[PDB]
Amino acid sequence: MVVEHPEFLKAGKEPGLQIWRVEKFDLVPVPPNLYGDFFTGDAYVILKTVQLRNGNLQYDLHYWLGNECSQDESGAAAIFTVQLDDYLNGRAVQHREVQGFESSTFSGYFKSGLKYKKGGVASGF
Amino acid sequence: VQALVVDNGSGNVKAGVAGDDAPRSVFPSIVGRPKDAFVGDEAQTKRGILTLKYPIEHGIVTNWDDMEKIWHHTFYNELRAAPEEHPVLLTEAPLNPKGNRERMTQIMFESFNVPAMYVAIQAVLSLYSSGRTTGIVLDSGDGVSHTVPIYEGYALPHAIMRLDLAGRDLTEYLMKILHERGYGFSTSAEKEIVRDIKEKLCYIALNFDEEMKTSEQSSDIEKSYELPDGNIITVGNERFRCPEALFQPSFLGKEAAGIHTTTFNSIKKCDVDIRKDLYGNIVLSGGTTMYEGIGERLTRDITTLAPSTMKIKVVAPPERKYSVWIGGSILSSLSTFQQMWITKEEYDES
Numbered sequence: 001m002v003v004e005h006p007e008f009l010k011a012g013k014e015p016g017l018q019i020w021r022v023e024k025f026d027l028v029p030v031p032p033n034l035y036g037d038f039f040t041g042d043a044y045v046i047l048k049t050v051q052l053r054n055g056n057l058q059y060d061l062h063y064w065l066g067n068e069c070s071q072d073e074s075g076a077a078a079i080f081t082v083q084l085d086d087y088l089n090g091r092a093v094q095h096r097e098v099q100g101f102e103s104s105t106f107s108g109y110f111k112s113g114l115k116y117k118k119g120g121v122a123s124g125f
Numbered sequence: 126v127q128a129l130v131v132d133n134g135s136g137n138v139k140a141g142v143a144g145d146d147a148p149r150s151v152f153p154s155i156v157g158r159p160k161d162a163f164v165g166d167e168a169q170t171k172r173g174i175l176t177l178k179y180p181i182e183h184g185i186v187t188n189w190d191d192m193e194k195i196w197h198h199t200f201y202n203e204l205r206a207a208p209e210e211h212p213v214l215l216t217e218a219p220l221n222p223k224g225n226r227e228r229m230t231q232i233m234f235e236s237f238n239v240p241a242m243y244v245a246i247q248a249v250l251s252l253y254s255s256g257r258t259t260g261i262v263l264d265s266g267d268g269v270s271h272t273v274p275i276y277e278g279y280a281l282p283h284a285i286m287r288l289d290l291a292g293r294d295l296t297e298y299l300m301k302i303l304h305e306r307g308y309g310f311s312t313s314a315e316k317e318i319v320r321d322i323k324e325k326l327c328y329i330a331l332n333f334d335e336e337m338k339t340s341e342q343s344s345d346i347e348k349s350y351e352l353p354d355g356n357i358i359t360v361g362n363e364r365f366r367c368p369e370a371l372f373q374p375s376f377l378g379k380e381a382a383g384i385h386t387t388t389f390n391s392i393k394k395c396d397v398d399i400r401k402d403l404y405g406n407i408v409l410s411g412g413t414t415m416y417e418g419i420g421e422r423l424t425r426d427i428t429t430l431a432p433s434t435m436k437i438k439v440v441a442p443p444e445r446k447y448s449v450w451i452g453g454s455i456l457s458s459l460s461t462f463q464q465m466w467i468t469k470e471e472y473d474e475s
């Protein structure tokens with residue numbers, strides 16, 4: 001079986017930006033009103049989908065690690081990244097993003113730039 | 126249903142439940158049978174009446190009957206879990222032959238009747254526990270050391286290096302060099318004591334030749350250890366000469382390349398376009414990577430060997446002794462794990 005998940009079924013269908021937070025060993029949508037603000041206590045998975053001129057879709061997967069996130073969260077973010085790439089037939093390029101050292105590509109996804117906030121969802125461990 | 130996670134080490138088994146941050150059970154990978162069978166700590170307490178055997182050699186299961194005794198002990202005496210009622214995640218060494226994987230699978234489904242199982246490569250689990258999908262893991266345990274390049278989640282099989290130099294060789298080398306000061310540690314019991322001395326007092330020199338110089342100039346090198354019998358032993362330059370063998374295997378009469386050279390060689394086997402990401406993500410795993418000073422020393426040595434355009438970063442997670450098991454705990458906790466395993470019914474009808 002191709003490994004799937006309801007969020008997997010929604011991923012990469014249209015050009016745009018999709019952000020999930022790791023919560024208790026699961027991949028949970030971030031409310032769109034919060035896009036660009038990241039909890040320092042958490043880990044996130046971000047899929048940027050681009051419609052190329054040929055019609056085809058290009059995928060970049062980024063996993064963002066907060067300075068205070070727990071090991072379950074960073075480990076799950078990495079694994080979910082692999083799984084979502086596999087779901088996309090391996091055609092995503094994967095990128096690790098650490099708080100305060102993110103790529104200019106990742107920063108550029110957010111018109112207001114990247115911002116951080118104290119707190120986060122409880123660890124699953 | 127909560128999965129059980131079992132890391133099958135040459136030296137110790139690590140076992141517990143998915144979702145824990147550390148294994149609840151850690152015990153020696155030893156089976157004793159009379160001179161029916163005893164496993165782990167109990168086997169060592171009855172070593173006087175038992176012949177002791179290690180069923181896992183260099184990370185590979187090589188005595189299947191005794192390995193089944195270890196797994197029985199794990200489920201029934203350590204965890205008190207019905208194996209037939211839990212999914213199980215089992216680990217395997219890099220480069221484990223598919224035939225060995227099939228044999229373990231057969232035993233789990235047909236001896237233990239596990240309902241579902243997943244087999245994971247140890248080094249991959251460790252990379253995940255570090256929060257990475259790309260890097261090169263240096264996993265040095267009791268019986269084997271491997272360097273395992275991983276790209277976007279998956280090991281690159283053609284680039285993995287196996288090194289038959291690990292912690293038990295280092296314990297034996299400390300036993301040997303302690304004869305210089307008149308100690309004669311030789312029995313299996315004495316070996317466990319020397320293992321503890323190694324873990325408590327050893328360290329890796331930043332520059333070996335300079336450390337030899339400085340340690341000769343005073344007694345500041347000397348540290349003391351209380352033996353079980355109450356006598357105190359004093360160890361000097363043995364403290365850093367012992368793990369130096371990781372870098373200089375000739376110290377053990379081995380012609381093998383050292384861990385820095387091996388890591389370099391492993392990266393070189395990968396195509397040029399991904400090497401930067403490997404050099405920048407050298408992740409240490411396993412008990413034999415626990416020596417103070419290892420990261421700084423590896424960084425110097427790998428920087429020397431690698432092209433000077435590369436950016437060398439050695440990562441030394443604090444809980445790296447357990448990183449394989451922890452990665453298994455995380456993986457087996459995910460919402461998607463149930464789609465990854467093989468079920469007993471599927472296996473039985475293959």
Ligand SMILES: Nc1ncnc2c1ncn2[C@@H]1O[C@H](COP(=O)(O)OP(=O)(O)OP(=O)(O)O)[C@@H](O)[C@H]1O
Pocket residue numbers: 133134135136137138181183184265266267268269270291292293296320323324325410411412413414415416446
């Ligand atoms: N703090 C320490 N310093 C040095 N060596 C250590 C330390 N802690 C454990 N070790 C050594 O690490 C080894 C055990 O490592 P580990 O548990 O990773 O191996 P394993 O999984 O049983 O074996 P393998 O992976 O080789 O099959 C032993 O040789 C032990 O003495």
Ligand SMILES: [Ca+2]
Pocket residue numbers: 041042043068069070073120121122123
């Ligand atoms: Ca959190």
Ligand SMILES: [Ca+2]
Pocket residue numbers: 085090091092093094277
């Ligand atoms: Ca990919």
